[PDB]
Short mmCIF file of C-alpha atoms in Angstrom, two decimals:
data_model
loop_
_atom_site.label_atom_id
_atom_site.label_comp_id
_atom_site.label_asym_id
_atom_site.label_seq_id
_atom_site.Cartn_x
_atom_site.Cartn_y
_atom_site.Cartn_z
CA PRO A 10 -7.49 -0.06 16.76
CA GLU A 11 -6.45 -3.58 15.68
CA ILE A 12 -8.68 -3.38 12.60
CA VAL A 13 -10.01 -0.61 10.35
CA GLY A 14 -12.48 -0.05 7.50
CA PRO A 15 -16.06 -1.30 7.09
CA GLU A 16 -16.97 -4.94 6.47
CA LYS A 17 -17.22 -4.44 2.73
CA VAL A 18 -15.05 -2.60 0.23
CA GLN A 19 -17.31 0.18 -1.16
CA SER A 20 -16.99 3.72 -2.49
CA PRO A 21 -14.59 5.51 -2.33
CA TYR A 22 -12.90 2.07 -2.50
CA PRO A 23 -11.41 0.39 -4.41
CA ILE A 24 -9.11 2.81 -6.20
CA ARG A 25 -7.07 1.25 -9.02
CA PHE A 26 -4.01 2.87 -10.55
CA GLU A 27 -0.74 2.11 -12.25
CA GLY A 28 2.28 4.31 -11.72
CA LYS A 29 6.02 4.45 -12.18
CA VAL A 30 8.33 3.79 -9.25
CA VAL A 31 10.71 6.72 -8.85
CA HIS A 32 14.20 6.23 -7.37
CA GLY A 33 13.89 2.44 -7.09
CA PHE A 34 13.51 0.37 -3.94
CA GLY A 35 15.88 1.92 -1.43
CA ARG A 36 18.41 -0.20 0.47
CA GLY A 37 17.38 1.28 3.83
CA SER A 38 13.76 0.12 3.81
CA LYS A 39 15.00 -3.11 2.20
CA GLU A 40 17.26 -3.65 5.25
CA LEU A 41 14.15 -3.18 7.44
CA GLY A 42 12.30 -5.81 5.41
CA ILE A 43 9.83 -3.23 4.08
CA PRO A 44 10.25 -2.92 0.29
CA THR A 45 9.20 0.66 -0.45
CA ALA A 46 8.22 2.35 -3.74
CA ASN A 47 7.45 6.01 -4.28
CA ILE A 48 4.84 6.46 -7.00
CA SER A 49 5.19 9.30 -9.50
CA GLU A 50 2.85 12.24 -8.87
CA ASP A 51 1.24 11.63 -12.27
CA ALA A 52 -1.35 8.85 -12.52
CA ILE A 53 -2.46 9.42 -8.92
CA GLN A 54 -3.72 13.03 -8.97
CA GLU A 55 -7.07 12.12 -10.56
CA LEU A 56 -7.56 8.75 -8.83
CA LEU A 57 -6.89 10.24 -5.38
CA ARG A 58 -8.68 13.57 -6.05
CA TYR A 59 -10.99 13.80 -2.96
CA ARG A 60 -9.01 11.53 -0.61
CA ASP A 61 -7.52 12.75 2.68
CA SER A 62 -3.79 12.47 3.29
CA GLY A 63 -2.68 9.64 5.53
CA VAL A 64 -2.12 5.90 5.50
CA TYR A 65 -4.14 3.58 3.24
CA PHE A 66 -4.04 -0.17 2.73
CA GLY A 67 -4.71 -2.68 -0.03
CA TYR A 68 -2.70 -4.71 -2.57
CA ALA A 69 0.06 -3.93 -5.03
CA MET A 70 1.57 -5.83 -7.94
CA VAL A 71 5.17 -5.74 -9.05
CA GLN A 72 7.04 -8.14 -11.29
CA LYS A 73 3.78 -10.03 -11.85
CA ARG A 74 3.25 -10.85 -8.18
CA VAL A 75 0.72 -9.49 -5.73
CA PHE A 76 1.47 -8.37 -2.17
CA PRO A 77 -0.62 -6.77 0.57
CA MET A 78 0.57 -3.21 1.31
CA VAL A 79 0.11 0.09 3.11
CA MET A 80 0.52 3.41 1.36
CA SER A 81 1.19 6.91 2.66
CA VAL A 82 -0.48 9.74 0.76
CA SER A 94 2.51 12.01 -3.20
CA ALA A 95 2.23 8.27 -2.57
CA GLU A 96 4.70 5.98 -0.81
CA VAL A 97 3.97 2.25 -1.05
CA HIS A 98 5.34 -0.20 1.56
CA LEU A 99 4.97 -3.77 0.35
CA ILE A 100 4.24 -6.44 2.98
CA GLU A 101 6.41 -9.55 2.58
CA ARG A 102 8.80 -11.56 4.78
CA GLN A 103 11.03 -13.37 2.31
CA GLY A 104 13.31 -10.56 1.20
CA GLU A 105 12.17 -10.69 -2.43
CA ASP A 106 14.12 -8.98 -5.20
CA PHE A 107 12.18 -5.86 -6.23
CA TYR A 108 13.58 -3.78 -9.09
CA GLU A 109 10.97 -3.14 -11.80
CA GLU A 110 9.78 0.41 -12.37
CA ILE A 111 6.05 -0.13 -12.95
CA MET A 112 3.61 -0.98 -10.16
CA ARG A 113 -0.13 -1.58 -10.05
CA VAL A 114 -1.89 -0.58 -6.82
CA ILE A 115 -5.42 -1.23 -5.57
CA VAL A 116 -6.34 0.86 -2.50
CA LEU A 117 -8.97 -0.89 -0.36
CA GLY A 118 -9.37 1.26 2.74
CA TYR A 119 -8.07 3.94 5.11
CA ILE A 120 -6.00 3.39 8.25
CA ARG A 121 -5.26 6.74 9.84
CA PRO A 122 -4.23 10.33 9.15
CA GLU A 123 -0.60 11.45 9.18
CA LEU A 124 1.09 11.85 12.54
CA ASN A 125 3.48 14.55 13.73
CA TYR A 126 7.09 13.46 13.18
CA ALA A 127 8.58 12.05 16.38
CA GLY A 128 11.85 10.53 15.16
CA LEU A 129 13.15 7.77 12.89
CA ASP A 130 12.38 4.82 15.15
CA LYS A 131 8.84 6.05 15.87
CA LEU A 132 8.32 6.40 12.11
CA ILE A 133 9.54 2.83 11.53
CA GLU A 134 7.45 1.42 14.41
CA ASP A 135 4.29 3.12 13.12
CA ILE A 136 4.84 1.44 9.75
CA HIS A 137 5.16 -2.00 11.33
CA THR A 138 1.94 -1.29 13.29
CA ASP A 139 0.10 -0.07 10.16
CA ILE A 140 1.20 -3.30 8.45
CA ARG A 141 -0.21 -5.47 11.24
CA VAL A 142 -3.50 -3.56 11.08
CA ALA A 143 -3.64 -3.78 7.29
CA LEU A 144 -3.17 -7.57 7.39
CA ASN A 145 -5.95 -7.85 9.97
CA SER A 146 -8.22 -5.52 7.99
CA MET A 147 -7.78 -7.46 4.74
CA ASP A 148 -8.56 -10.83 6.38
CA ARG A 149 -12.24 -10.20 5.53
CA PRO A 150 -13.70 -11.79 2.35
CA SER A 151 -14.68 -8.50 0.71
CA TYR A 152 -11.02 -7.43 0.96
CA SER A 153 -9.04 -10.64 0.29
CA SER A 154 -10.84 -11.24 -3.01
CA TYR A 155 -9.08 -8.23 -4.49
CA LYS A 156 -5.82 -10.15 -4.45
CA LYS A 157 -7.19 -11.83 -7.58
CA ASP A 158 -8.63 -8.64 -9.10
CA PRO A 159 -8.66 -8.56 -12.94
CA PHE A 160 -6.56 -5.39 -12.68
CA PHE A 161 -3.69 -7.67 -11.58
CA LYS A 162 -4.01 -9.89 -14.64
#
């Protein structure tokens, strides 16, 4: 599907949390134009308590700037941006707005990378709606 999630953001969404980025933003995903941050197990256990594993979407803030994102749930955040920004800080705020799909069986490196680009396209489409886009200015990102 080209789009996912109901018209409005409602329970279980949104899910707000702040966590530390462990192991920095790797050069590999950076070379692919997908800044990636792995969130520390702590700070997400309670906020993600009853959520199924898989790929989620929403917004994330780093270095005082907000970007749309997709996150694999452990939590791996892939920021969506096309300018090759310099990400290095260790604290990130994330707001999960909806679910995209469950995890898929591993089928190689390129398939993994292509699924991420697809998830990103779908996330962008899914957040085009007013109930979703307003969270870019959420007080949590103050």
